[PDB]
Design an enzyme around this catalytic site. Structure first.
Site, mmCIF file in Angstrom:
data_model
loop_
_atom_site.group_PDB
_atom_site.id
_atom_site.type_symbol
_atom_site.label_atom_id
_atom_site.label_comp_id
_atom_site.label_asym_id
_atom_site.label_seq_id
_atom_site.Cartn_x
_atom_site.Cartn_y
_atom_site.Cartn_z
ATOM 1 N N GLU A 186 27.851 -54.177 22.727
ATOM 2 C CA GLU A 186 29.246 -54.590 22.348
ATOM 3 C C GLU A 186 29.636 -55.941 22.629
ATOM 4 O OE1 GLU A 186 31.357 -51.167 24.214
ATOM 5 O OE2 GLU A 186 30.992 -49.760 22.673
ATOM 6 N N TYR A 249 34.401 -44.127 17.570
ATOM 7 C CA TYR A 249 35.425 -43.433 18.369
ATOM 8 C C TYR A 249 36.840 -43.377 17.882
ATOM 9 C CZ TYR A 249 31.801 -44.088 22.234
ATOM 10 O OH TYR A 249 30.681 -44.247 22.825
ATOM 11 N N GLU A 256 45.045 -44.231 16.336
ATOM 12 C CA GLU A 256 43.877 -43.353 16.262
ATOM 13 C C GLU A 256 44.296 -42.017 16.840
ATOM 14 O OE1 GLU A 256 40.071 -45.608 16.556
ATOM 15 O OE2 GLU A 256 41.446 -46.520 17.825
ATOM 16 N N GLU A 286 26.414 -44.862 19.530
ATOM 17 C CA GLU A 286 27.387 -43.994 20.539
ATOM 18 C C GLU A 286 28.423 -43.498 19.740
ATOM 19 O OE1 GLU A 286 29.226 -46.288 23.479
ATOM 20 O OE2 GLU A 286 27.378 -47.431 24.189
#
Length: 394
Positions: A186, A249, A256, A286
Site C-alpha cells: 500500500e 474494501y 461507500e 486483501e
C-alpha cells in the site's frame, strides 16, 4: 510451485502477527488507557516499543509471536480448504535505523512458518508491509501519520532489506513454498512521486532476477485506476512472472458506506468484471466482510468511525454499538453479510483468487475468518452458496 493461469488462490492474511495493529490486538494497547482518556495510548508499534523499552517490549512480543499464529493454525487453514497465506513483515525485522526503537526476533518465527506451510501443502507470499520513514502514514506501516519513504536514504534502505529477503526466501531453499515476494504494501500513490515509485519497483524486479530467483514479483496497485499498470513490467519487454495485488474494501469513505446492500453487491461484481480486462495476472490480496468502519480503533487509536459521522468529516449513516458483537447482530445484518461475502468470492475467483484480511482478531468479527466461519457467515466449504449467481459472469 504455482500456475496463476489455471489455479485459483483461496487464502488468508496472517495479519497482526509481525506488525502490531491496535484494532486487531487491543489487549496490547488498552492497558495504557487511564479511564476513558485515550490520549496516553501509544498509536503504533514504533511508539509502543518506545514507551516499553527494549527489554520489556521483547518479553511481551515473544509471548505474542509464539501464540498468535502457530503450527495448529496452519493445520486448521488446510482443513478448511484454503491453499495459501500472505505474511506481512516490517523492515525492522531485518535492519534498524540508527535511532529505531523496534526489537527483532520475527525472523525465527517466519522460518518456522515456512516449515509449517510446507508440511500442510500451503503456499506463501512474503510481504514487506512497512518501510523506513513510512510509505503511507498508516499504523499498519509501523509509523502512523508520517510519509518519508521517498525522503533522504529511506528508498535505498528499503531496497537493501528487499535484497536480503530476495536472497534468503527467493532461492532454491523455499521454492516449493514461496510463490511471491511483494515489494511494498500500500504505497500511498496520491501523496508520492509516481515516477520515483515506478523506478523503485523496477530496481526491485531487476535485483530479484539478478540473484537467480524465479519467484513471482508482486506489486501492490498503489491505489491507482484499473489498467494503470498495464504497460509496466511486461512480457513484451522481457519482464516476466509479475502479479498485481489489488485490495478491495467499501468502508473507507462516507459515499461507500452510504450504499444499500444491493449497491454494495453491484460494486463487488464490477471489481471482477474490470479485473478480467487487465493485462497482468492479478489477485485480491486483501478484502473483508466489513460493511462498516465500526471495529474499535479501525481508523487508528483515539479516532472514531465514519459510519456514525465521527471521522474524516463523513456524515452520520448508522450507530456502531449494536454491531460490535456478532451475537447481538440482527437477522438482516447476518443476511447482508452472507450475501456480500459470496458476491466477493465469485468476483475474485473470476481472476487470480483472493486473500481474506484476516485469519483472526481478538474481537473484531467483520475482520476474522475464524469468527465468520464458526458463525455460519463465511461459506464452508468455501464453494458453498446460499445466494448462487448474484453477478452472472460470462
Amino acid at each position: 510451485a504455482w500456475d496463476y493461469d489455471n489455479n485459483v488462490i483461496r487464502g488468508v492474511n496472517l495479519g497482526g502477527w509481525f506488525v502490531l495493529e491496535p484494532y486487531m490486538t487491543p489487549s496490547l494497547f488498552e492497558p495504557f488507557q487511564n479511564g476513558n482518556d485515550q490520549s496516553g495510548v501509544p498509536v503504533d508499534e514504533y511508539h509502543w516499543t518506545q514507551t516499553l523499552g527494549k527489554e520489556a517490549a521483547l518479553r511481551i512480543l515473544q509471548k505474542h509471536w509464539s501464540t498468535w499464529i502457530t503450527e495448529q493454525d496452519f493445520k486448521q487453514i488446510s482443513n478448511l480448504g484454503l491453499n495459501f497465506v500472505r505474511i506481512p513483515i516490517g523492515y525492522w525485522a531485518f535492519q534498524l535505523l540508527d535511532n529505531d526503537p523496534y526489537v527483532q526476533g520475527q525472523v525465527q518465527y517466519l522460518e518456522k512458518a515456512l516449515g509449517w506451510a510446507r508440511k500442510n501443502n500451503i503456499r506463501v507470499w512474503i510481504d514487506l508491509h512497512g518501510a523506513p520513514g513510512s510509505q503511507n502514514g498508516y499504523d499498519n506501516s509501523g509509523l502512523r501519520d508520517s510519509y518519508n519513504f521517498q525522503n533522504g536514504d529511506n528508498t535505498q534502505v528499503t531496497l537493501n532489506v528487499l535484497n536480503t529477503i530476495f536472497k534468503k526466501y527467493g532461492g532454491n531453499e523455499y521454492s516449493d513454498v514461496v510463490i511471491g515476494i511483494e515489494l511494498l504494501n500500500e504505497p500511498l500513490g496520491p501523496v508520492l512521486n509516481m515516477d520515483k515509485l515506478k523506478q523503485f519497483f523496477l530496481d526491485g524486479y531487476n535485483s530479484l532476477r539478478q540473484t537467480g530467483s524465479v519467484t513471482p514479483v508482486i506489486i501492490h496497485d498503489a491505489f491507482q485506476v484499473f489498467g494503470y499498470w498495464n504497460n509496466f513490467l511486461t512480457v513484451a519487454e522481457g519482464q516476466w512472472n509479475v502479479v498485481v495485488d489489488h485490495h478491495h474494501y467499501q468502508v473507507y469513505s462516507g459515499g461507500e458506506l452510504s450504499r444499500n446492500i444491493n449497491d454494495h453487491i453491484s460494486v463487488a461484481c464490477n471489481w471482477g468484471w474490470d479485473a478480467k480486462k487487465e493485462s497482468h495476472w492479478n489477485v485480491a490480496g486483501e478484502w473483508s466482510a466489513a460493511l462498516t468502519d465500526c471495529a474499535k480503533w479501525l481508523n487508528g487509536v483515539n479516532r472514531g468511525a465514519r459510519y456514525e459521522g465521527a471521522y474524516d468529516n463523513a456524515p452520520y449513516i448508522g450507530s456502531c454499538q449494536p454491531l460490535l458483537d456478532i451475537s447481538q447482530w440482527s437477522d438482516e445484518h447476518k443476511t447482508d453479510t452472507r450475501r456480500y461475502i459470496e458476491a466477493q468470492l465469485d468476483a475474485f475467483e473470476y481472476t487470480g483468487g483472493w486473500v481474506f484480511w484476516s485469519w483472526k482478531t481478538e474481537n473484531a468479527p467483520e475482520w476474522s475468518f475464524q469468527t465468520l466461519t464458526y458463525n455460519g457467515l463465511f461459506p464452508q466449504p468455501v464453494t458453498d452458496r446460499q445466494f448462487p449467481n448474484q453477478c452472472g459472469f460470462h
